[PDB]
Amino acid sequence: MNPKRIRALKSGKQGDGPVVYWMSRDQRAEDNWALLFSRAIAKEANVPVVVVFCLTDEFLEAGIRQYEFMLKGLQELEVSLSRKKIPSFFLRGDPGEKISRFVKDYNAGTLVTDFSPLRIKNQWIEKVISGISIPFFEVDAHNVVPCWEASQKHEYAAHTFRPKLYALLPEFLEEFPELEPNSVTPEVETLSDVLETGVKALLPERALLKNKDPLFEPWHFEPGEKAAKKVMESFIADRLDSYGALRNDPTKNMLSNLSPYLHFGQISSQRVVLEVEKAESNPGSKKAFLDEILIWKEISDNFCYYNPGYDGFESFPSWAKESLNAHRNDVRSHIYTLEEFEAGKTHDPLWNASQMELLSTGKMHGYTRMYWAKKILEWSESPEKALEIAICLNDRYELDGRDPNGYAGIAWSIGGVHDRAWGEREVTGKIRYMSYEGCKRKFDVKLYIEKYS
Ligand SMILES: Cc1cc2nc3c(=O)[nH]c(=O)nc-3n(C[C@H](O)[C@H](O)[C@H](O)COP(=O)(O)OP(=O)(O)OC[C@H]3O[C@@H](n4cnc5c(N)ncnc54)[C@H](O)[C@@H]3O)c2cc1C
């Protein structure tokens, strides 16, 4: 129980009622530092711990693919917390109003939530803080090393954040203590009812094709805390050995496929790191996978935390803002609208195959994601339009969308964030360029195109 994982958002008078855990980003019962610290505070106060989840009005800004994945996991989570005598309350509406009412109605003594550097999460905290008088804590249950402890500033490169994160690994990379159940069961609708209503409201915006059939294939990633563990065990036993040599081959499914579970917090990355470190395989493949789940994943939280405008052109490096500004008036070879990018109606078959995989599976390959967003910059009227188009298609169709990884991954491709300057080209400027011929020399582009017609 390292006290550096928990930060105080607002001090106040601790009430004589239960400790309330505000689950937002880490929807899981095991390996949850936020839930564990809530159980410790509750035990020292001689009071049980409760879990609350808010079903916000922003769910309609996404699709059914993300609403069903996250609600089906909550149905499994409600069972697991029930086995620990931990009641879970699911509220619908504004967190600033539903939590401020839950705290006063249930006589909350302490409020705890998990950490998320997103702007929407900071909006809820501001509304909640002004409506409560009890202590307010937050816990970094998503990163191995707390985001405010790994670095005190924004790291402009990976080679500057890697020594800082690895130097703190011997302290924060530890095993998880068991979640002690509540002593006695203590003293707002069914999740299946909220799922049917939410789907009926989202159906008119469902992604379809010509024959009115749905585009999403939900049999690729089963949601839940139990399904995340099976995926982790399959990757370590079957795909971890070849990850280093095939992570850039979209025609091979050699990736861990853990991101949708990682985004919703259905599995803890620290648990994944612990299992991989004890696994004996290719050292080059292990070093490559850890550089993705530790360095690049937690540097995305670092990027969103220390850059308020992480989704804007202002967060780009000075060399990239000046390079893009010098090529703003360059005549673009193509200009596609958001509807053409969404439907995959560009002249690039490789790009359309990446967009069709996104629409069909909700998880586009990591390598094509770099090509997918860089061509949005090349075929847009301005870098700002490319950012908004890339963010829209990402957050809407990616199962791991609306994530700090997504915003840091798009800032890297369009604005060179966490990258360096390359040869100066037109339109794109000094941003790293990925050509269609370059992808042909890296993998079989024909097999990837034919797989997603
Ligand atoms: C344009 C673009 C958009 C992106 N949008 C998303 C997004 O919406 N959501 C999202 O979680 N990630 C996004 N990524 C990061 C990355 O593409 C995915 O995390 C990765 O492809 C997820 O599939 P995986 O779990 O099988 O990858 P793996 O190769 O098995 O890696 C495991 C984990 O390492 C992390 N990771 C790997 N690569 C990156 C990376 N480049 N940046 C940050 N973390 C990484 C991820 O958490 C990932 O789950 C984006 C990257 C780009 C270039």
- Same-domain pairing of 169 and 282: yes
Residues 134 and 221 in one domain: no
Atom 37 (ligand 1) nearest CA:
292
Going by alpha carbons, the residue nearest to atom 13 of ligand 1 is 406
**Type of residue found at 17:** G
DSSP 66-83: HHHHHHHHHHHHHHHHHH
CA 208 – ligand 1 centroid, Å:
26
Residue having the nearest C-alpha atom to atom 44 of ligand 1 = 297
Strand, helix or coil for residue 256: coil
Name the strand (E) or helix (H) holding 10: strand 6-10
259: CA distance to ligand 1 center in Å?
7
Distance (Å, rounded) from C-alpha 397 to C-alpha 375? 18
Domain with 10, as residue range(s), is 1-141
Strand partners, 114: 139
Q: Are residues 156 and 136 in the same domain?
A: no
Are 195 and 75 found together in one domain?
A: no
Method of structure determination = X-ray
Distance CA 15, CA 107 (A): 7
The total number of structural domains in the chain stands at: 3
Contact, 168 vs 133, CB < 8 A? no
DSSP designation for 291: I
Q: How far apart are CA 246 and CA 235, in angstroms?
A: 13
Q: How far is the CA of 405 from the centre of ligand 1 (A)?
A: 6
Give the distance between the most distant pair of CA atoms in the chain: 69
Most informative mutation of 397, 400, 419 for ligand 1 (most atoms within 8 A of CB): 400
Q: In 3D, which of 78, 66, 355 has the Cα closest to residue 221?
A: 66
What is the dihedral angle through the alpha carbons of 124, 82, 47, 137, rounded to the nearest 10 degrees?
Answer: -20
d(CA 438, CA 240): 26
Residues 200 and 214 in one domain: yes
Show which of 111, 141, 171 is a domain's final residue: 141
- 329 with 393, same domain? yes
Residue 291: partners with Cβ closer than 8 Å, 6 or more residues away: 158, 162
Residue 151 and residue 276 share a domain: yes
Task: Give residue 366 CA to ligand 1 midpoint distance, Å.
Answer: 6
For residue 376, how far is the Cα from the chain centroid?
A: 21
C-alpha Rg value of the chain to the nearest Å: 22
Pairwise CA distance, residues 89 & 53, whole Å = 6
Rounded Cα–Cα distance for residues 145 and 140 (Å): 8
Residues 50 and 102: their CA atoms lie apart, in Å, by 11
* Residue where a domain stops, chosen among 277, 312, 347: 312
Q: Are residues 330 and 342 in the same domain?
A: yes
Q: Whose CA is nearest to atom 7 of ligand 1?
A: 406
Binding site for FAD, by residue number, is: 243, 256-259, 292, 363, 369, 394, 400, 405
Nearest CA, atom 26, ligand 1: 257
- The Cα-based distances of 13 to 101, 105, 233, 272 in angstroms read 17, 16, 45, 38
Cα angle 163, 256, 312 (rounded to 5 degrees) comes to 60
* CB-defined site of ligand 1, < 6 Å: 247, 255-259, 262-263, 292-293, 296-297, 300, 366, 369-370, 373, 394, 398, 400-401, 403, 405-406, 408-410, 413
Atom of ligand 1 nearest to the CA of 412: 53
Q: How far is ligand 1, taken at its centre, from the CA of residue 136, in Å?
A: 31
Helix H or strand E segment including 88: strand 88-92
Residue type, 236: I
Cα gap 312→119, rounded to integer Å:
12
Binding site listing: 243, 256-259, 292, 363, 369, 394, 400, 405
Question: What's the reported resolution, in angstroms, to a tenth?
Answer: 2.1
Give the distance (Å) from ligand 1 centre to CA of residue 363.
Answer: 9
- Ligand 1: distance of its center to the CA of 296 in Å? 8
In contact, 247 and 98? CB cutoff 8 Å = no
- Out of 292, 351, 377, mutate this one to test ligand 1's pocket (max ligand atoms within 8 Å of CB): namely 292
Lay out the sheet containing 49-55: strands in order across: 6-10, 136-139, 110-114, 19-23, 49-55, 88-92
> What pairing do the DSSP bridges indicate for beta strands 88-92 and 110-114?
unpaired
Distance 301 CA to ligand 1 centre (A): 13
CB 379 within 8 A of CB 333: yes
Domain boundary among 257, 286, 312: 312
Whether 339 and 265 map to the same domain: the answer is no
Of the candidates 322, 343, 295, 276, the residue with the CA atom closest to the CA atom of residue 431: 322
Which ligand 1 atom is nearest residue 410's CA?
A: 1
Is residue 48 left, alpha or beta, with left meaning phi > 0 and alpha meaning psi from -120 to 50?
A: beta
Distance 108 CA to ligand 1 centre (A): 37
Q: Find tokens 């409020």 and name the residue.
A: 111
Q: Are residues 42 and 113 in the same domain?
A: yes
Residues 119 and 154 in one domain: no
- Give residue 413's identity as a one-letter amino acid code: S
* Alpha carbon of residue 242 to chain centroid: 25
Q: Whose CA is nearest to atom 30 of ligand 1?
A: 256
Q: Which atom belonging to ligand 1 lies closest to the Cα atom of 395?
A: 8
Reference 398, options 207, 203, 172, 183; nearest CA is 207
Same domain, 12 and 70: yes
